[PDB]
Design a protein around this nucleic acid. Structure first.
Ligand SMILES: [Ca+2]
Ligand SMILES: [Ca+2]
Ligand SMILES: [Ca+2]
Ligand SMILES: [Ca+2]
Ligand SMILES: [Ca+2]
Ligand SMILES: [Ca+2]
Ligand SMILES: [Ca+2]
Ligand SMILES: [K+]
Length: 35
DNA sequence: CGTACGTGCGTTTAAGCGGTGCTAGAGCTGTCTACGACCAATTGAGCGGCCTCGGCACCGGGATTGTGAAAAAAAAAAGCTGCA
């Protein structure tokens, strides 16, 4: 096992900016996909 | 059914032409060095996997607020005059 490739994405940085501008609001996986 | 737009005319304008004179700056060359690629070593930021726990989808009951449809009233219009 331990495949799923390792696919890079901006989602940690998106979350990081989100917590700056709106610290109590989160984000669905589709919405993250669009970001 | 009313007039905005196409046609044609006379009047006016300035584009185009060709020419001249001047130079800003496009673009090329040579020099030199600050910067970015390249490399190996190192390791923590970010990856996948995994579990949890509350957001959010779904439910039922009733009040309330849009959202419109019909029915009822009000009005404007149509036809009819009876005098002066
Ligand atoms: Ca005229
Ligand atoms: Ca120059
Ligand atoms: Ca870590
Ligand atoms: Ca994850
Ligand atoms: Ca309901
Ligand atoms: Ca309404
Ligand atoms: Ca309505
Ligand atoms: K340089």
């Amino acid at each position: 096992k331990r495949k799923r490739s390792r696919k890079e994405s901006y989602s940690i940085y998106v979350y990081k900016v989100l917590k700056q501008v709106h610290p109590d609001t989160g984000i669905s996986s589709k919405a993250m996909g669009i970001m």
